[PDB]
């Protein structure tokens, strides 16, 4: 690499250069910088509105939010300090942003802080066994924030209930609204209260003066389910600035390549984003953001 004359000796593998023209290599211009152009970050699913929603269903009554055909950006909610605690199972919070999910079910409910520690794959206790159980393969995360200034009031808030008693333990992803009276002993119940007949559902006492462990916390459990169906909800795509007429490494939508971008007089069909040549190598593209 010292001199172009020395490139002749190294290519010919001889210390003597005879008179003539010799091609010792082929130069190629390396890309200066990486260009990232992604589609608009709008048309999301409103996770911030559901997390920040006024009232929630009971832990046994929890509402199933079907999340499909949108983009999920979890970096904004995590860096906004809008939650009390953050916990995940099996997947780092940064990995979720690069992955696409087939179907996502947002699990919303309000329980006391002492009952939040029981949310984890294959655990036990009151909320895990009798209310909502997490499967061992659950890939989602646990996010909670302190609602004591909202969901609690003077005199107690009876809106948020829970299932105290059940004859067995629930399976993961099993919602049971049955109000049937739990029979403790051999005394018949049949939906009638009495000796060894007790109403299983109970209402959480909620007031703003409750202790930190007993304060009501809004918990949104994100269920990430990958099925055989194609993935719908994907992580956030953050577009960058565009550079033209230079050698760059560009990644456009799901297409990558290296070359020089120049706007020409060609016109693609409105339904055709990418062009190709005779060899099916891309000779032109359309920007995912601007047209």
């Amino acid at each position: 690499a010292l001199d172009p004359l020395s490139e002749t000796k190294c290519t010919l593998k001889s210390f003597t250069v005879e008179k003539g023209i010799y091609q010792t290599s082929n130069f190629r211009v390396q890309p200066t910088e990486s260009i990232v152009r992604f589609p608009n970050i709008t048309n999301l699913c409103p996770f911030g509105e559901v997390f920040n929603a006024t009232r929630f269903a009971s832990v046994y009554a929890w509402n199933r939010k079907r999340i499909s055909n949108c983009v999920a950006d979890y970096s904004v909610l995590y860096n906004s300090a809008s939650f009390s605690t953050f916990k995940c199972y099996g997947v780092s919070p940064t990995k979720l942003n690069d992955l696409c999910f087939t179907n996502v079910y947002a699990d919303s409910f309000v329980i006391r802080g002492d009952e939040v520690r029981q949310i984890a794959p294959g655990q036990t206790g009151k909320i895990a066994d009798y209310n909502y159980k997490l499967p061992d393969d659950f890939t989602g995360c646990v996010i909670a924030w302190n609602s004591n200034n909202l969901d609690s009031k003077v005199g107690g808030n009876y809106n948020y209930l829970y299932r105290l008693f059940r004859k067995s333990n629930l399976k993961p992803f099993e919602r049971d609204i049955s109000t049937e009276i739990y029979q403790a002993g051999s005394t018949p119940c049949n939906g009638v209260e009495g000796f060894n007949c007790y109403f299983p559902l109970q209402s959480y006492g909620f007031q703003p003066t409750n202790g930190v462990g007993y304060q009501p916390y809004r918990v949104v459990v994100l269920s990430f389910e990958l099925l055989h169906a194609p993935a719908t909800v994907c992580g956030p795509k953050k577009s960058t600035n565009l550079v033209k007429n230079k050698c760059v490494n560009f990644n456009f939508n799901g297409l990558t390549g290296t070359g020089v971008l120049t706007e020409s007089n060609k016109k693609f069909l409105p339904f055709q984003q990418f062009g190709r040549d005779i060899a099916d190598t891309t000779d032109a593209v359309r920007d995912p953001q601007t047209l």
Binding site: K266, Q272, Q273, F274, R276, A284
Partner: peptide, 11 residues
């Protein structure tokens, strides 16, 4: 129909 969104012209 166009098999995909690939654009091809004069080929």
């Amino acid at each position: 129909y166009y098999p995909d969104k690939v654009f091809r012209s004069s080929v």
